[model samples]
Target: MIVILDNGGQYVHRIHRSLKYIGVSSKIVPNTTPLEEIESNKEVKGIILSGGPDIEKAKNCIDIALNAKLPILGICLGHQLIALAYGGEVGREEYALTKVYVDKEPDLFKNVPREFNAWASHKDEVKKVPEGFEILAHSDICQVEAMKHKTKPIYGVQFHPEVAHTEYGNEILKNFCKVCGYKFE
Candidate 1:
């Protein structure tokens, strides 16, 4: 089961629905939900951090997700929180959809194209990537469009891949579940 920590994103439910559509079991909880509650779930295979209003406020969930050592995917505000949790910087930028150039093909973008249009509804962007993390993709406005921790199964995307505007959104998400050890027919 994939555990989704909801950070008040308008499309948070859409993430849960998307996972279900792909035949993965998932559960969503408030960002403030205790870490022990999430960690104790033996069936939990991966964690997803949903987009929200602020970066600093989302650290609690980010911390627990990281410590869990599970494949973790963060979106939008959750992306910024990942940067913060890993000793990086995040700054405000104009919000709009943009073309993302994939610099490195990480497991998250395995079947995704090198460049594609993605739905970006984020004002806060990762300005400086933390140590042991590399930028996987970038947009004209935001330099750090996507990132991944070097030695861990953790990743973040500034765009809302959960939204329909992203052309390969579902495929990107499917790649994530594959990283979490799911086999698609």
Candidate 2:
């Protein structure tokens, strides 16, 4: 089972539903939910930070999950939180569809094409990668479209992998599930 940290994003439910659609059980928890509360759940196989409207308000929530030492994936605002927490910069970007080129193939992009279209609906983008992290994918507008922490089970994507607009959204989610030790049928 995975825990979806709801940061009051419109797509929070979609993130939960997307995981379930791929055979992974998930529950949405408020961003304010205490770390100890979620840490108590042995069934929490991984953590997902859902996109939201604001960046400043979501940092505390992301920090709690980061301290839990669990596999984590962040999207959109959630993605920005991860970058900020790791000493990276974030800036505004126009909302549009962008082509992402995979720089290094991580498990999340395994079986995914090297380049593909991904939905981009964010004003804030990761301007720089955090220390001990490398860019997984890049786009013309966003330099760091996707990134992963070195020696940690943490990942982030600027695009909405839960939306149907992304060509390989499901595949990427499936690969993330695999990273969490989920076995697909």
Give the Cα RMSD of candidate 2.
Answer: 1.5
lDDT of 2 by residue, 1-185 (tens): 99888888788888988887888899998888777887799988788888888876676665663586778899988788888888888887445668999986678898789999998875888888888988899887678889999878889999988888888999999988888888776
**Over 4 Å off, model 1:** 93-95
Model 1 — which ten-residue stretch has the worst lDDT? Answer: 57-66
* Candidate 1, 1-185: lDDT as tens digits: 99998898788998988888888889998888777787688898888999887655666865674586778898888788888887889787444668999896677787888999998865678889989999999877778989989888888999888777887888888988988889888
lDDT of the candidates, in the order given: 0.83, 0.84
TM-score of 2: 0.94
Could you say which candidate leads in TM-score?
A: 2
* Top candidate by lDDT: 2
Weakest 10 consecutive residues, lDDT, candidate 2?
Answer: 57-66
Clashing pairs in 1: none
Q: For each of the candidates, give the backbone clash count.
A: 0, 0
Error of 2 at 91 (Å): 2.0
